Design a protein around this ligand. Structure first.
Ligand SMILES: Nc1ncnc2c1ncn2[C@@H]1O[C@H](COP(=O)(O)OP(=O)(O)OP(=O)(O)O)[C@@H](O)[C@H]1O
Ligand SMILES: [Mg+2]
Length: 480
């Protein structure tokens, strides 16, 4: 089981099945393989990764498959990344080639920028031997910035095989992707979908910002398998039609990247009693995710906050005696690109074993891992210590809060109090009373000093470009 081989076998079985769909733009398995070989011909000899630029054109997938076959790999760059960071990336990468999959012109200080047109009308042969090997760097994905992470081809093959076993909805399914391709969550949709003959359906930024457009896309395609961040799922729960009775095609979900709120999982389990729902956790540095747990009624009833589950093959998890989880194994990245200090500082791979220090406080209780917080988001107030996420979880377990993020406030380089930005369960008609009620509701769940002074009621929490809660942008609304 090899990525190119399963895709090619499926393309040979069903050349006219759709491999990729972005609104009306469709790409069949035959064209995905045809155009990917043509790109590989233009790409061969290249021992530098191909920059992959665009948003949601199906030719981004062409780019990925082409970069795999030529063996040089790719660096996915989404149009939502600021231009100066794009310049920084192309500069670090030293590409020979840049695939501009958008309609507008792109130009790059390094390498040859070509368009889809160069491939649509290329005359190069449509058969090309894949020359990737296990230890090649298949992709380099850059960190959010909350450095380019390098991933071995074998890590990807392994990760996809894991997703294929976790998948209970079979082959030839309609898959949904939300993550931009510069966010490795999309990998969790791209390759398990193509490796099982599915159709990768692309949600773009516009759909994320204008939910009526998302609703339209959902009505045009009956989605079966859904891969997204928890925050995106939370937003889509406000589509009332999105339930098992009215949208019965949808029966499997994979979430990664953020804490999955117990309330959100509860609602989804309620509205799709038959769906296979997985919570997964992992950093970019260990190939997308390393744990999974199926969320059921029992998992909900029995776990006040959800675990992230058990480790996968290629990922041996251990916990340092301060609680920092460490991942060892094939899932571990080779390291950040031409950034030796940043690599030494969290990566230890000596004697051929590979280890990554995660920065998340994790705890293992009765067969299951829990992610409690990012080490940085730990506060001492009144000489006491909780993880910011824990405070936020306590706020979410309150009938007046539908969603909540907590902002520490500082001076003289030390936290002074907390402000809670709240999406309330009800529009907050009155200002004094809700502050009163949230604080009183907290008497049970929090020691006084960890209850925020202020609340800032927000209609909606802003999301990052990757679909996570935008902490920085939430800070700015509070800070003046
Ligand atoms: N299911 C989950 N539950 C709780 N936390 C999660 C889950 N999945 C991922 N995380 C968090 O997301 C982190 C991985 O995020 P990602 O690799 O996409 O970028 P980042 O670490 O958020 O930002 P940066 O690019 O600055 O590192 C993990 O370190 C963990 O903190
Ligand atoms: Mg990280």
């Amino acid at each position: 089981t090899d990525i190119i081989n399963k895709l090619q076998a499926f393309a040979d079985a069903n050349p006219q099945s759709i491999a990729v769909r972005h609104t009306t733009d469709e790409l069949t398995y035959q064209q995905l393989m045809d155009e990917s070989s043509k790109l590989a011909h233009r790409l061969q000899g290249s021992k530098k990764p191909m920059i992959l630029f665009g948003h949601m054109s199906p030719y981004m997938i062409v780019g990925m498959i082409g970069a795999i076959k030529a063996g040089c790999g790719y660096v996915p760059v989404d149009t939502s990344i600021p231009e100066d960071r794009i310049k920084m990336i192309i500069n670090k990468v030293q590409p020979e080639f840049v695939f501009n999959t958008t309609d507008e012109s792109f130009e790059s200080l390094e390498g040859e920028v070509f368009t889809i047109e160069d491939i649509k009308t290329s005359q190069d042969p449509v058969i090309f031997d894949s020359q990737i090997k296990d230890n090649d760097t298949v992709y380099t994905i850059f960190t959010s910035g909350s450095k380019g992470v390098q991933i071995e081809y074998a890590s990807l093959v392994q990760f996809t095989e894991w997703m294929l076993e976790l998948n209970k909805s079979g082959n030839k399914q309609q898959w949904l992707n939300q993550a931009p391709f510069s966010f490795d969550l999309s990998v969790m949709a791209i390759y398990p979908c193509l490796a099982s003959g599915g159709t990768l359906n692309l949600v773009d930024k516009n759909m994320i910002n204008k939910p009526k457009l998302l609703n339209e896309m959902l009505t045009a395609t009956p989605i079966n398998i859904w891969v997204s961040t928890p925050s995106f799922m939370e937003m889509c729960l406000l589509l009332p039609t999105l339930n098992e009775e009215q949208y019965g095609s949808l029966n499997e979900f994979f979430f990664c990247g953020e804490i999955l709120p117990h309330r959100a999982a509860k609602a989804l389990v309620s509205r799709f009693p038959s769906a296979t729902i997985y919570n997964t956790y992992g950093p970019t540095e260990a190939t997308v995710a390393v744990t999974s747990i199926q969320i059921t009624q029992e998992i909900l009833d029995q776990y006040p906050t959800l675990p992230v589950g058990v480790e996968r093959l290629g990922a041996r998890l251990s916990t340092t005696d301060d609680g920092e989880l460490v991942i060892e194994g094939q899932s571990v990245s080779l390291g950040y690109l031409k950034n030796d200090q940043k690599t030494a500082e969290v990566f230890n791979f000596d004697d051929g074993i590979r280890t990554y220090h995660t920065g998340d406080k994790a705890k293992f209780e009765n067969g299951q891992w829990f992610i409690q917080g990012r080490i940085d988001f730990q506060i001492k107030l009144n000489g006491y210590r909780m993880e910011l996420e824990e405070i936020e979880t306590q706020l979410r377990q309150s009938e007046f809060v539908k969603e909540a993020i907590v902002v520490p406030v500082y001076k003289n380089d030390k936290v002074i109090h907390l402000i809670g930005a709240i999406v309330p369960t009800t529009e907050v008609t009155d200002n004094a009373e809700m502050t009163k009620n949230i604080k009183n509701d907290l008497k049970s769940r929090l020691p006084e000093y960890m209850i925020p002074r202020k609340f800032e009621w927000m209609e909606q929490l802003p999301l990052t470009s990757n679909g996570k809660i935008d902490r920085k942008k939430i800070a700015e609304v509070i800070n003046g």
